[PDB]
Amino acid sequence: VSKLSQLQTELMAALLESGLSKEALIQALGE
Amino acid sequence: VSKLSQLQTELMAALLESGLSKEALIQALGE
Amino acid sequence: MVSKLSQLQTELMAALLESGLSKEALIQALGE
Amino acid sequence: MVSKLSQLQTELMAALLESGLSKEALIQALGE
């Protein structure tokens, strides 16, 4: 999880910065 | 956005499959 | 034999390539 | 000059490398 957790976290941050919408997030939460 | 949207979507899907938690998602929603 | 981390790496690279990642970027990465 | 897509590509590659992406994986990607 270290490397995995770090990858997930940095990916999420980049995604948000790229403009990932609240709608995408909400959809993700429903999965 | 095509390529960008497609990248975001596929990245999210992979993230979820890797075990991205509800807690991470919720944190993301608060940003 | 394939961990969650490896699988995520694989999928991420695939998505990167599809998005148009260039050979140059790949070359630079190799130089790291 | 750097689009959101390019920037995301850059950050994703950086994160991939940090996670331990191998040279072999990079070689294979180049062969695509």
mmCIF file of C-alpha atoms in Angstrom:
data_model
loop_
_atom_site.group_PDB
_atom_site.id
_atom_site.type_symbol
_atom_site.label_atom_id
_atom_site.label_comp_id
_atom_site.label_asym_id
_atom_site.label_seq_id
_atom_site.Cartn_x
_atom_site.Cartn_y
_atom_site.Cartn_z
ATOM 1 C CA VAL A 1 0.000 0.000 0.000
ATOM 2 C CA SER A 2 2.819 2.445 0.497
ATOM 3 C CA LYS A 3 3.664 2.668 -3.137
ATOM 4 C CA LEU A 4 0.090 1.898 -4.024
ATOM 5 C CA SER A 5 -1.349 4.410 -1.629
ATOM 6 C CA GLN A 6 1.118 7.021 -2.788
ATOM 7 C CA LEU A 7 0.262 6.360 -6.426
ATOM 8 C CA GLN A 8 -3.465 6.565 -5.758
ATOM 9 C CA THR A 9 -3.082 9.801 -3.829
ATOM 10 C CA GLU A 10 -0.925 11.519 -6.397
ATOM 11 C CA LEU A 11 -3.176 10.336 -9.197
ATOM 12 C CA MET A 12 -6.222 11.691 -7.475
ATOM 13 C CA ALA A 13 -4.570 14.998 -6.900
ATOM 14 C CA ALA A 14 -3.581 15.276 -10.521
ATOM 15 C CA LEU A 15 -7.073 14.313 -11.583
ATOM 16 C CA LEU A 16 -8.637 17.015 -9.489
ATOM 17 C CA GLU A 17 -6.231 19.529 -10.809
ATOM 18 C CA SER A 18 -7.082 18.554 -14.335
ATOM 19 C CA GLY A 19 -10.691 19.461 -13.651
ATOM 20 C CA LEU A 20 -12.282 16.195 -12.513
ATOM 21 C CA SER A 21 -15.894 17.110 -11.756
ATOM 22 C CA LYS A 22 -18.028 16.636 -8.684
ATOM 23 C CA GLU A 23 -20.314 14.597 -10.875
ATOM 24 C CA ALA A 24 -17.517 12.120 -11.668
ATOM 25 C CA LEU A 25 -16.727 11.862 -8.011
ATOM 26 C CA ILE A 26 -20.329 11.256 -7.112
ATOM 27 C CA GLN A 27 -20.595 8.583 -9.762
ATOM 28 C CA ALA A 28 -17.452 6.965 -8.297
ATOM 29 C CA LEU A 29 -18.981 7.022 -4.833
ATOM 30 C CA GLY A 30 -21.976 5.079 -6.141
ATOM 31 C CA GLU A 31 -19.839 2.262 -7.475
ATOM 32 C CA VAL B 1 -11.665 17.066 -23.321
ATOM 33 C CA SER B 2 -12.106 14.000 -25.461
ATOM 34 C CA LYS B 3 -8.684 12.663 -24.776
ATOM 35 C CA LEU B 4 -8.681 14.365 -21.421
ATOM 36 C CA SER B 5 -12.094 13.120 -20.463
ATOM 37 C CA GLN B 6 -11.214 9.636 -21.617
ATOM 38 C CA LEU B 7 -7.989 9.678 -19.616
ATOM 39 C CA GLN B 8 -9.750 10.906 -16.491
ATOM 40 C CA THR B 9 -12.456 8.276 -16.814
ATOM 41 C CA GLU B 10 -10.106 5.381 -17.361
ATOM 42 C CA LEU B 11 -7.863 6.567 -14.556
ATOM 43 C CA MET B 12 -10.756 6.761 -12.173
ATOM 44 C CA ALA B 13 -11.901 3.323 -13.098
ATOM 45 C CA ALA B 14 -8.466 1.890 -12.535
ATOM 46 C CA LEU B 15 -8.218 3.699 -9.232
ATOM 47 C CA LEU B 16 -11.462 2.252 -8.002
ATOM 48 C CA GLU B 17 -10.424 -1.161 -9.063
ATOM 49 C CA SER B 18 -7.192 -0.807 -7.183
ATOM 50 C CA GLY B 19 -9.170 -0.257 -4.004
ATOM 51 C CA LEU B 20 -9.552 3.525 -3.778
ATOM 52 C CA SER B 21 -11.599 4.087 -0.624
ATOM 53 C CA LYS B 22 -14.812 5.957 0.000
ATOM 54 C CA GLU B 23 -12.837 8.076 2.405
ATOM 55 C CA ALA B 24 -10.470 9.205 -0.371
ATOM 56 C CA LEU B 25 -13.420 10.028 -2.534
ATOM 57 C CA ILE B 26 -15.078 12.006 0.202
ATOM 58 C CA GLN B 27 -11.883 13.916 0.828
ATOM 59 C CA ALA B 28 -11.724 14.672 -2.920
ATOM 60 C CA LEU B 29 -15.289 15.944 -2.862
ATOM 61 C CA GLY B 30 -14.345 18.422 -0.138
ATOM 62 C CA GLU B 31 -11.571 19.958 -2.197
ATOM 63 C CA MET C 1 1.340 -13.048 -9.316
ATOM 64 C CA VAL C 2 0.117 -9.570 -10.356
ATOM 65 C CA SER C 3 -0.388 -7.231 -7.366
ATOM 66 C CA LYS C 4 -2.909 -4.459 -7.203
ATOM 67 C CA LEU C 5 -0.029 -1.960 -7.614
ATOM 68 C CA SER C 6 1.228 -3.720 -10.771
ATOM 69 C CA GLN C 7 -2.218 -3.888 -12.201
ATOM 70 C CA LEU C 8 -2.818 -0.185 -11.580
ATOM 71 C CA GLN C 9 0.570 0.586 -13.197
ATOM 72 C CA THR C 10 -0.452 -1.379 -16.224
ATOM 73 C CA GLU C 11 -3.805 0.232 -16.599
ATOM 74 C CA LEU C 12 -2.375 3.701 -16.080
ATOM 75 C CA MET C 13 0.248 3.194 -18.769
ATOM 76 C CA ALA C 14 -2.378 1.889 -21.184
ATOM 77 C CA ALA C 15 -4.559 4.963 -20.546
ATOM 78 C CA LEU C 16 -1.528 7.234 -20.935
ATOM 79 C CA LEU C 17 -0.676 5.720 -24.290
ATOM 80 C CA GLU C 18 -4.205 6.001 -25.516
ATOM 81 C CA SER C 19 -4.309 9.688 -24.529
ATOM 82 C CA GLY C 20 -1.416 10.303 -26.899
ATOM 83 C CA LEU C 21 1.664 9.966 -24.706
ATOM 84 C CA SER C 22 4.671 10.670 -27.028
ATOM 85 C CA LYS C 23 7.791 8.632 -27.678
ATOM 86 C CA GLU C 24 9.803 11.553 -26.489
ATOM 87 C CA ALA C 25 8.087 11.443 -23.147
ATOM 88 C CA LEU C 26 8.764 7.786 -22.956
ATOM 89 C CA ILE C 27 12.419 8.407 -23.903
ATOM 90 C CA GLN C 28 12.792 10.961 -21.178
ATOM 91 C CA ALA C 29 11.251 8.649 -18.653
ATOM 92 C CA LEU C 30 13.762 5.996 -19.602
ATOM 93 C CA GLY C 31 16.578 8.451 -18.819
ATOM 94 C CA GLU C 32 15.469 8.725 -15.204
ATOM 95 C CA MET D 1 1.466 26.337 -24.007
ATOM 96 C CA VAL D 2 0.862 23.336 -21.704
ATOM 97 C CA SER D 3 -2.749 22.071 -21.848
ATOM 98 C CA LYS D 4 -4.572 20.432 -19.009
ATOM 99 C CA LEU D 5 -4.203 17.086 -20.844
ATOM 100 C CA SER D 6 -0.416 17.530 -21.173
ATOM 101 C CA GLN D 7 -0.093 18.512 -17.585
ATOM 102 C CA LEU D 8 -2.074 15.483 -16.421
ATOM 103 C CA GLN D 9 0.106 13.258 -18.653
ATOM 104 C CA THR D 10 3.176 14.689 -17.042
ATOM 105 C CA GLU D 11 1.983 14.265 -13.525
ATOM 106 C CA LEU D 12 0.767 10.739 -14.192
ATOM 107 C CA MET D 13 4.113 9.688 -15.629
ATOM 108 C CA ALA D 14 5.942 11.202 -12.663
ATOM 109 C CA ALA D 15 3.693 9.284 -10.238
ATOM 110 C CA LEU D 16 4.165 6.099 -12.271
ATOM 111 C CA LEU D 17 7.926 6.408 -12.105
ATOM 112 C CA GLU D 18 7.891 7.058 -8.415
ATOM 113 C CA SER D 19 5.733 3.961 -7.839
ATOM 114 C CA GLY D 20 8.494 1.870 -9.377
ATOM 115 C CA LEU D 21 7.552 1.649 -13.047
ATOM 116 C CA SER D 22 10.274 -0.550 -14.685
ATOM 117 C CA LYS D 23 12.460 0.103 -17.703
ATOM 118 C CA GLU D 24 11.002 -2.962 -19.274
ATOM 119 C CA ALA D 25 7.546 -1.502 -19.041
ATOM 120 C CA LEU D 26 8.809 1.648 -20.573
ATOM 121 C CA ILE D 27 10.520 -0.374 -23.336
ATOM 122 C CA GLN D 28 7.330 -2.192 -24.113
ATOM 123 C CA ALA D 29 5.400 1.026 -24.240
ATOM 124 C CA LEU D 30 7.882 2.376 -26.741
ATOM 125 C CA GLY D 31 7.180 -0.631 -28.986
ATOM 126 C CA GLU D 32 3.529 0.337 -29.310
#
